[PDB]
Design an enzyme around this catalytic site. Structure first.
Site, PDB file in Angstrom:
ATOM      1  CD  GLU A  46      -3.081   0.687  -0.078  1.00 38.18           C
ATOM      2  OE1 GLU A  46      -2.498   1.775  -0.429  1.00 38.18           O
ATOM      3  OE2 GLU A  46      -4.254   0.462  -0.486  1.00 38.18           O
ATOM      4  CG  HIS A 112     -11.676  -5.938 -14.483  1.00 43.07           C
ATOM      5  ND1 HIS A 112     -12.569  -6.646 -15.266  1.00 43.07           N
ATOM      6  CD2 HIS A 112     -11.790  -4.628 -14.913  1.00 43.07           C
ATOM      7  CE1 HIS A 112     -13.170  -5.821 -16.128  1.00 43.07           C
ATOM      8  NE2 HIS A 112     -12.725  -4.594 -15.915  1.00 43.07           N
ATOM      9  CD  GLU A 199     -17.962  -2.828 -14.567  1.00 43.23           C
ATOM     10  OE1 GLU A 199     -17.700  -3.754 -13.733  1.00 43.23           O
ATOM     11  OE2 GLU A 199     -17.061  -2.128 -15.142  1.00 43.23           O
TER      12      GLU A 199
HETATM   13  N1  LIG Z   1     -15.820  -4.940  -5.634  1.00 42.03           N
HETATM   14  C1  LIG Z   1     -15.182  -4.286  -6.566  1.00 42.03           C
HETATM   15  O1  LIG Z   1     -14.901  -3.061  -6.325  1.00 42.03           O
HETATM   16  C2  LIG Z   1     -14.659  -5.086  -7.613  1.00 42.03           C
HETATM   17  C3  LIG Z   1     -13.402  -4.841  -8.143  1.00 42.03           C
HETATM   18  N2  LIG Z   1     -12.804  -5.590  -9.061  1.00 42.03           N
HETATM   19  C4  LIG Z   1     -11.457  -5.321  -9.583  1.00 42.03           C
HETATM   20  O2  LIG Z   1     -10.628  -5.268  -8.392  1.00 42.03           O
HETATM   21  C5  LIG Z   1      -9.496  -4.356  -8.648  1.00 42.03           C
HETATM   22  C6  LIG Z   1      -9.440  -3.404  -7.491  1.00 42.03           C
HETATM   23  O3  LIG Z   1     -10.592  -2.530  -7.407  1.00 42.03           O
HETATM   24  P1  LIG Z   1     -11.111  -1.860  -6.087  1.00 42.03           P
HETATM   25  O4  LIG Z   1     -11.051  -2.776  -4.883  1.00 42.03           O
HETATM   26  O5  LIG Z   1     -12.439  -1.220  -6.376  1.00 42.03           O
HETATM   27  O6  LIG Z   1      -9.934  -0.720  -5.906  1.00 42.03           O
HETATM   28  P2  LIG Z   1     -10.060   0.506  -4.861  1.00 42.03           P
HETATM   29  O7  LIG Z   1     -10.615   1.684  -5.706  1.00 42.03           O
HETATM   30  O8  LIG Z   1     -10.707   0.201  -3.566  1.00 42.03           O
HETATM   31  O9  LIG Z   1      -8.506   0.809  -4.616  1.00 42.03           O
HETATM   32  C7  LIG Z   1      -7.692  -0.009  -3.753  1.00 42.03           C
HETATM   33  C8  LIG Z   1      -6.771   0.874  -2.944  1.00 42.03           C
HETATM   34  O10 LIG Z   1      -5.861   1.456  -3.911  1.00 42.03           O
HETATM   35  C9  LIG Z   1      -5.311   2.593  -3.264  1.00 42.03           C
HETATM   36  N3  LIG Z   1      -5.252   3.695  -4.272  1.00 42.03           N
HETATM   37  C10 LIG Z   1      -6.274   4.422  -4.766  1.00 42.03           C
HETATM   38  N4  LIG Z   1      -5.840   5.327  -5.695  1.00 42.03           N
HETATM   39  C11 LIG Z   1      -4.486   5.184  -5.742  1.00 42.03           C
HETATM   40  C12 LIG Z   1      -3.408   5.843  -6.462  1.00 42.03           C
HETATM   41  N5  LIG Z   1      -3.710   6.856  -7.298  1.00 42.03           N
HETATM   42  N6  LIG Z   1      -2.132   5.414  -6.295  1.00 42.03           N
HETATM   43  C13 LIG Z   1      -1.861   4.441  -5.412  1.00 42.03           C
HETATM   44  N7  LIG Z   1      -2.812   3.765  -4.708  1.00 42.03           N
HETATM   45  C14 LIG Z   1      -4.106   4.119  -4.835  1.00 42.03           C
HETATM   46  C15 LIG Z   1      -6.150   2.979  -2.059  1.00 42.03           C
HETATM   47  O11 LIG Z   1      -5.485   2.744  -0.817  1.00 42.03           O
HETATM   48  C16 LIG Z   1      -7.417   2.097  -2.278  1.00 42.03           C
HETATM   49  O12 LIG Z   1      -8.041   1.792  -1.046  1.00 42.03           O
HETATM   50  C17 LIG Z   1      -9.766  -3.729  -9.953  1.00 42.03           C
HETATM   51  O13 LIG Z   1      -9.056  -4.446 -11.001  1.00 42.03           O
HETATM   52  C18 LIG Z   1     -11.278  -3.899 -10.165  1.00 42.03           C
HETATM   53  O14 LIG Z   1     -11.788  -3.871 -11.490  1.00 42.03           O
HETATM   54  C19 LIG Z   1     -13.312  -6.890  -9.304  1.00 42.03           C
HETATM   55  C20 LIG Z   1     -14.516  -7.259  -8.768  1.00 42.03           C
HETATM   56  C21 LIG Z   1     -15.317  -6.357  -8.022  1.00 42.03           C
HETATM   57  C1  LIG Z   2     -20.807  -4.517  -9.808  1.00 37.62           C
HETATM   58  C2  LIG Z   2     -19.338  -4.509  -9.350  1.00 37.62           C
HETATM   59  C3  LIG Z   2     -19.157  -5.057  -7.939  1.00 37.62           C
HETATM   60  N1  LIG Z   2     -18.465  -5.331 -10.165  1.00 37.62           N
HETATM   61  O1  LIG Z   2     -18.720  -6.805 -10.319  1.00 37.62           O
HETATM   62  C4  LIG Z   2     -17.393  -4.937 -10.786  1.00 37.62           C
HETATM   63  O2  LIG Z   2     -16.893  -5.714 -11.636  1.00 37.62           O
HETATM   64  C5  LIG Z   2     -16.663  -3.635 -10.520  1.00 37.62           C
HETATM   65  O3  LIG Z   2     -16.762  -3.132  -9.410  1.00 37.62           O
HETATM   66  O4  LIG Z   2     -15.913  -3.311 -11.411  1.00 37.62           O
HETATM   67 MG   LIG Z   3     -17.901  -7.432 -12.037  1.00 40.59          MG
HETATM   68 MG   LIG Z   4     -15.877  -4.573 -13.080  1.00 41.81          MG
END
Ligand SMILES: NC(=O)C1=CN([C@@H]2O[C@H](COP(=O)(O)OP(=O)(O)OC[C@H]3O[C@@H](n4cnc5c(N)ncnc54)[C@H](O)[C@@H]3O)[C@@H](O)[C@H]2O)C=CC1
Ligand SMILES: CC(C)N(O)C(=O)C(=O)O
Ligand SMILES: [Mg+2]
Ligand SMILES: [Mg+2]
Ligand SMILES: NC(=O)C1=CN([C@@H]2O[C@H](COP(=O)(O)OP(=O)(O)OC[C@H]3O[C@@H](n4cnc5c(N)ncnc54)[C@H](O)[C@@H]3O)[C@@H](O)[C@H]2O)C=CC1
Ligand SMILES: CC(C)N(O)C(=O)C(=O)O
Ligand SMILES: [Mg+2]
Ligand SMILES: [Mg+2]
Ligand SMILES: [Mg+2]
Ligand SMILES: [Mg+2]
Lengths: 331, 331
Positions: A46, A112, A199
């Protein structure tokens, strides 16, 4: 196609391995804690200071009991370098903080397919490149694990110079209990396209625009906004839970015959062929790179559309009246 | 507009009243058991044999520990005669089995305004006429009550010759714990129209057509139906849970920035102004009696459209693959 469950997957390969979870946000928090709860060694990569302030995700990871390192040191330490940073910032962070620490025999992992699919990250030949993609928001993924279930997942392998890439990726899904719901094996590209599509068109874009439009139609016709909120928003969860449990069949059994008739007589008049054609067009733009180019350019320009949309979202009456109603719950 | 909660309503009037719940189906079963659990005296009005066979609802209500009578004897005994039969059958059952047992100052109660609003049932002048309408499917209403919470409700009064119609209606909602979420006062006509609109356009018609069209688009583009299911249906519950908890704001915080961008960039291209206009048109047919006449005529004809629709639903891939998937979950 076939769905893999606990009975199909060996998780043994993770015994000797450290997973470096890069980013402790929605997915990183959920996946690192499910991994740790399952006995896997996890370190968090992080960034302590972001945009000149203390990064709450760095502090949270520490407080939650992890070893927390700068991304570059985490990468050195991880046998799997699992990138759970926002998609838009992964290519820079990867070029600058991860790539110089890669070595033959590491796996680069994602949840992803976007950055590999669209060639925004092109890893070296001698690292495994894998994807474990949960079909779930991270908060709900963690609760599913804590309830003794899991969320569905998609698993992909783009590079396998170790010979072990698939086994590692599946093992992670099993450790995270996603196999309890089910795993589908696919390519990076497939996951990318379906996920962007869902999405945009169904889960987030589709759902929100459906509820917002319904809510507006009621309020503009003179119905109280509280009433529109209860009908269009609050009750959606209750109806969707029935579909999630037993499909349309279960939902249709429980709702009135009046409603079931209305569903079939009128629903397709609201969401008809034109919607399906617009969905096709959106899927094409996902598949052909147009949407990806747009999102990369958006991020390059400082996300002004996203910033403006967030501000406008919060001004909508569905959000202000909803927040007032939910705050008054005896829950 | 005012929302009534627990502290706003006194339920003590129900202390010496018996509620006759007519129909022990999704709503009658939930409502009867919540009322009984809150200490209210309930009797079930049911029909022992339906279509030449034992009615399982009759048996179930005996089994769940209620006094179970024929509708005519139940109506005799109830101070509140609460009609939780299918809307389409209420008029004949009311005329034949209920109306001759009505005495001055009983209350006739409903959980949907349809039959009173559209003048399919015209109660005597000397009975109270009330409505307690939950904004919830009955199974999830019962769960909410057992969980220490409640579902939102709408309360209307059409006739108040006793003076106590409102007090009784509100009291019922407090005893069923709907006041924990909140109660809105409204007219019979308002409930009827918003309810019909919501189920048609948003909750059932809209939701199912949204998921079905998304699922079809994926499958028609060569993605596996299991993948289309997890993306378009199983994940919908996880997303809607976020909205239910914390609005679009909460959901947008948890999804990825990629998804949040997609939601605002693409959602309104799928579900746009044309959809809103269809919704307006559907609401007009609800408000002006067109829909109501169509549903009456459908029932009079032996529900052939609803039968044909049921059959085709159960043959859709979303249903056959979803059933196969859900059977293989390991909770
Ligand atoms: N539940 C979801 O949000 C889902 C996400 N994904 C995939 O998971 C991966 C992560 O997504 P999220 O958990 O939504 O990420 P997130 O937006 O929560 O970011 C993770 C962490 O990255 C750090 N961060 C944010 N901006 C930054 C920067 N400019 N430089 C350095 N660090 C930074 C922060 O500490 C943040 O908490 C992506 O590839 C996304 O497409 C897959 C399934 C669902
Ligand atoms: C709807 C959401 C949780 N999803 O599945 C994603 O892939 C995203 O957050 O990018
Ligand atoms: Mg998804
Ligand atoms: Mg997605
Ligand atoms: N969750 C829901 O289903 C909701 C229903 N409503 C309203 O509640 C009322 C009850 O609807 P539901 O519970 O869906 O009713 P239902 O369809 O579950 O019917 C209740 C019972 O009526 C009996 N019955 C069925 N057909 C009959 C017939 N031909 N003759 C005699 N008895 C018969 C059966 O025992 C059945 O269990 C309606 O006014 C409806 O609009 C309101 C809110 C939500
Ligand atoms: C969606 C459904 C449960 N609903 O709220 C109803 O009004 C119905 O079943 O008629
Ligand atoms: Mg039915
Ligand atoms: Mg309703
Ligand atoms: Mg209804
Ligand atoms: Mg975000």
């Amino acid at each position: 196609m076939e769905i893999l469950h606990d009975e199909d997957v060996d998780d043994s390969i993770l015994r000797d391995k450290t997973i470096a979870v890069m980013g402790y946000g929605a997915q990183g928090d959920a996946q690192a804690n499910c991994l740790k709860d399952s006995g896997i060694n996890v370190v968090i990569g992080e960034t302590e200071i972001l945009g000149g302030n203390k990064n709450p995700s760095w502090e949270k990871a520490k407080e939650d009991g992890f070893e927390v390192l700068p991304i570059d040191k985490a990468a050195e330490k991880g046998d799997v370098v699992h990138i759970l940073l926002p998609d838009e910032v992964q290519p820079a962070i990867y070029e600058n903080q991860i790539k110089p620490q890669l070595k033959a025999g590491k796996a680069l992992c994602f949840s992803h397919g976007f950055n590999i699919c669209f060639k925004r990250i092109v890893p070296p030949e001698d690292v495994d490149v894998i994807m474990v993609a949960p079909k779930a928001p991270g908060t709900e993924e963690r609760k599913a694990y804590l309830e003794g279930f899991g969320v569905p997942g998609l698993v992909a392998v783009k590079q396998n110079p170790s010979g072990e890439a698939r086994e590692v990726a599946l093992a992670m899904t099993k450790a995270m209990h996603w196999t309890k719901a089910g795993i589908l094996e696919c390519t990076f590209e497939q996951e990318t396209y379906e996920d962007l599509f869902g999405e945009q068109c169904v889960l987030c874009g589709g759902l929100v625009e459906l509820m917002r439009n319904g809510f507006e139609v009621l309020v503009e016709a003179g119905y109280p906004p509280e009433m529109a909120y209860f009908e269009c928003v609050h009750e959606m969860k209750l109806i969707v839970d029935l579909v999630w449990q037993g499909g349309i069949k279960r939902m249709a059994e429980v709702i009135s015959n009046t409603a079931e008739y209305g569903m079939w007589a009128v629903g397709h008049q609201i969401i008809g062929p034109e919607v399906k054609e617009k969905m096709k067009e959106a899927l094409k733009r996902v598949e052909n790179g147009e949407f990806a180019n747009e999102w990369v350019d958006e991020y390059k320009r400082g996300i002004p559309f996203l910033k403006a949309s967030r501000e406008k979202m919060g001004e909508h009456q569905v959000e202000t009246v909803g927040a007032e109603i939910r705050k008054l719950f005896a829950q």
